[PDB]
């Protein structure tokens, strides 16, 4: 349950002078009907043949291999959901006041500065498609500005105004158009958080459980895999989105060779 203050403009304070003036009275009001966040599940049923599991498991265990690959697929789906889920996704959660559009198409440094204006209080990172990142680098080259690079998790990422750009292929690119997101993260600073359920039965990884369902008459055993998660944006200014980003335009530079 995400509680919030709904009278920010009615909290009155007074600057005092060297006198006996009366003081204002005030109180802080809360939203009567706060939004409650509820975990959604990504789940599947995996079927493994008992004969295969019994016979072909040295030097590799078949059930464990199947479970590992299925869990990898589930985690990729979770990453996709965190962006594109219709009710808790980032793109759906952004507000019209926090949505802006490109000036004349491709993602220019002026556009990224405009996005930083919308998120000026401790911005965390940009999230973008690799095509959009390449287009931004191309625009920077056209303007003659080489962006610096930072090292995170053993990889190199370009930065703008000190804020790294992070690639994600889950961001949809339709008709050469895409979107770029700017995010602030963490509870202490009223940022974006993810939500998970601890202490699951048959838990393998935090928020993920695997349970044996039974063996059917075809000698096939079934396993249930479930992952519960959600996403919450504590304050509106923690998220901004730039739309109508074009990624298919290349500059024609004049040449004169010796």
């Amino acid at each position: 349950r995400l509680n919030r203050v709904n009278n920010t403009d009615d909290i009155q304070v007074a600057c005092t002078q060297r006198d006996e003036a009366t003081l204002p009275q005030t109180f802080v009001d809360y939203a009567p009907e706060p939004r409650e966040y509820f975990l959604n599940g990504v789940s599947t049923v995996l079927d493994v043949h008992t004969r295969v599991a019994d016979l072909y498991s040295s030097p590799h265990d078949q059930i464990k291999e199947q479970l590992r690959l299925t869990i990898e697929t589930i985690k990729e789906r979770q990453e996709s959901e965190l962006i594109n889920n219709p009710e808790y996704g980032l793109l759906a959660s952004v507000t019209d006041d926090q949505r802006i559009s490109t000036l004349n198409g491709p993602p220019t440094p002026d556009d990224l500065d405009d996005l930083l204006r919308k998120v000026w209080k401790e911005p965390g990172f940009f999230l973008a498609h690799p095509d959009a990142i390449a287009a931004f680098g191309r625009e920077c080259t056209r303007r003659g500005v080489p962006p610096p690079t930072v090292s995170l998790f053993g990889s190199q990422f370009i930065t703008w105004r000190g804020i790294p750009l992070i690639p994600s292929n889950k961001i949809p690119v339709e008709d050469g158009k895409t979107k770029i997101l700017l995010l602030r993260v963490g509870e202490k600073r009223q940022g974006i958080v993810g939500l998970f359920q601890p202490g699951l039965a048959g838990e393998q990884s935090p928020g993920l459980s695997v349970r044996f369902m039974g063996i059917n008459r075809n000698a096939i055993a079934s396993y249930l895999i479930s992952l519960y998660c959600s996403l919450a944006v504590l304050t509106d200014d923690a998220l901004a989105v730039l739309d109508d980003v074009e990624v298919d335009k290349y500059h024609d530079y004049p040449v004169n060779y010796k």
């Binding site: 349950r1 509680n3 009275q25 109180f27 802080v28 009001d29 809360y30 939203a31 009567p32």
Partner: protein, 44 residues
């Protein structure tokens, strides 16, 4: 309004929740009064 109201204030408060109540529960005196004998293999 002079101060924060009860309806708004409750949003931060944790309700005390009971286990569901069942109306059909009866004392079932006969089961308590009877003497119960174990059978080895379901035959008496």
């Amino acid at each position: 309004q002079l101060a924060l109201g009860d309806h708004a204030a409750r949003q931060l408060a944790n309700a005390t929740k009971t286990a569901p109540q069942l109306s059909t529960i009866t004392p079932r005196w006969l089961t308590h009064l009877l003497q119960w004998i174990p059978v080895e293999a379901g035959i008496y």
